Amino acid sequence: VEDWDLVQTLGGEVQLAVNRVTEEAVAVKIVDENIKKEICINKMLNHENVVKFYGHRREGNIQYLFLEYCSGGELFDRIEPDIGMPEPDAQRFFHQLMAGVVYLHGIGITHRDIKPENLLLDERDNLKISDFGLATVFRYNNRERLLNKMCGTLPYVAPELLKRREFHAEPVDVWSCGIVLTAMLAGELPWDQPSDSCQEYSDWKEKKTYLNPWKKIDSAPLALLHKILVENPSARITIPDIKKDRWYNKPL
Total of chain residues touching ligand YVQ, rule CB under 6 A: 13
Phi, psi of 28 (to 5 degrees): -120, 130
Residue ranges in 159-188 that form contacts with ligand YVQ under rule CB under 6 A: none
Q: Nearest approach, Cβ of 129 to ligand YVQ (angstroms)?
A: 11
Classified as helix, coil or strand, 84 is strand
> Which one of the spans 8-16, 31-39, 168-176, 200-208 is the region binding ligand YVQ (CB under 6 A)?
8-16
| Pair 155, 190: CB distance under 8 Å | yes
Closest CA to 55 of 37, 38, 67: 67
Task: Determine if 66 is a binding residue for ligand YVQ (CB under 6 A).
Answer: no
Q: Count Cβ atoms below 10 Å from residue 50 Cβ, excluding itself.
A: 24
- Measured from the CB atom, is 37 or 226 closer to ligand YVQ? 37
Would you call 5 a catalytic residue per the annotation?
A: no
Of 113, 173, 192, 241, which is the active-site residue? 113
Beta bridge partner(s), residue 190: none
- Which of 40, 48, 55, 73 contacts ligand YVQ by CB under 6 A? 73
Residue ranges in 29-58 that form contacts with ligand YVQ under rule CB under 6 A: 29
| Pair 201, 232: CB distance under 8 Å | no
Q: Nearest approach, Cβ of 176 to ligand YVQ (angstroms)?
A: 17
Classified as helix, coil or strand, 34 is helix
Residues making up the binding site for ATP? 10-14, 29
CA distance 192 to 205: 15
| Residues annotated as part of the active site | 113
Q: Which residues bind ligand YVQ (CB under 6 A)?
A: 10-11, 14, 27, 29, 67, 69-70, 73-74, 120, 130-131
